[model samples]
Target: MERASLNRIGKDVYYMQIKGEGTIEKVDGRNLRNYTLPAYDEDGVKKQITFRSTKKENDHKLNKYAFLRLYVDQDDNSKNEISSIEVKSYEEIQKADLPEKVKDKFTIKLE
Candidate 1:
C-alpha cells in the first residue's frame, strides 16, 4: 500500500537519502519509528520512504523531535521493502523549522 509512493532512483544513484518526520509505533510486532510520507529525496522529489529504527537497540531513545533522515541502499529497492542503512534524527528542531519543500507534502499530524 505505502509502497505506491516509493520512488525509484537511477542506477547512477548508489543510495537514496530521504528526510521526513516520524514517531514511535509498533509495526509487524516490533516497536519502531517508521520514516515515511511528506518525505523527499536528494532530488527534492516527494517520496514515500519505508524504513525504521527498532526499539530493540533503544532506538526509541533517539526519538527526540521526530524528524529523521534515512539512507536506503538502492539494492533494497529490489524487494520493494527498502531498509535504512543509516538514520539521523533532528532532536533539536521544531516542525516549523522544516524546509518549505518538505512541509508542503506533509499529510501527517505534526503535533
Candidate 2:
C-alpha cells in the first residue's frame, strides 16, 4: 500500500495519515520507550510505527526520541511507518551527521 500523506508542522514534528486502513493497536517496543506497530492486515502492510518517549536522566526530566525498529513486510515495504523515513523533506534530512550525543544503539548492513 502506498502512503496516504505526511505533513510536517515543524522540525522533527510530523503527522502520519494511515492508508490501507485496518484495526490499529497500541504496542510497545523492546526498550519500552521505542515502539512498533504490528497491525494485522493480509495485504502485507503490517510494519507499524509509534512514537515512544523515553525519560532521560536530568535534574528534573529529559527525553530521547528514536524510530522504532523498522520492519519490512514480505513485499519489502512498510505499509505505514517506513513512509515516515522515505518521505522526509529534504530540509529535515539536510544534515547527515549523527546527533551530537548519539550513542551506539545498533548496526544494520546489506550485502
Candidate 3:
C-alpha cells in the first residue's frame, strides 16, 4: 500500500488517505471495517479516528467521507495511530496481497 503523511488542521482536525480491503467482520454481528488509526502524541494519545463509508445505526459521523479526523485520547494505544494514509483503488487493493507481517499483526484469517 502507498503511504502519505497526515495533515493536521487546527487543534482537532487531521487528514489522511488509506487504501486496503477497508472491511472487517466479526462473528457477533458487529463489524470493524473501513477503519484506520493515525498517530499518537508524546503523551501516548491516539490522534486519529476512523469511520465507515456508509453509516450503520451504530456508525460514527466521521465515516461518512473517505477523509478522516483524528481523535485524541490519553489512555489509548498511541502506537496504533496511523502516521500515514495509503490510497489505493479497489482493484489495486484486491490484486495485492497482504504482507506476512501485516497479516500476522492484524490477525486476519480468510475462510
Q: What TM-score does each of the candidates earn?
A: 0.32, 0.16, 0.28
Clash pairs, candidate 1, are none
Candidate 2 residue-wise lDDT, 49-88, digit = tens: 4533334322221112222222222323445544443322
Point out where model 1 deviates above 4 Å. 1-36, 59-65, 76-111
Model 1, 57-103: lDDT tens per residue? 44424333345444444436466775544442323233454554444
lDDT of each candidate versus the true structure: 0.45, 0.28, 0.37
Weakest 10 consecutive residues of candidate 3 by summed lDDT? 87-96
Candidate 3 clash pair list: 37-82, 38-81, 38-82, 39-81, 39-82, 51-63
Higher-TM-score candidate among 2 and 3? 3
TM-score for predicted model 2 compared with the true structure:
0.16
Give a tens-digit lDDT track for model 3, residues 1-111: 776856454333233334343568675788656555543222324345444454323333223223332334333336766433432111112102333323332332552
Better of 1 and 3 by lDDT: 1
Let me know the TM-score candidate 1 reaches against the reference structure.
Answer: 0.32
- Please state the error at residue 71 of candidate 2 in Å: 17
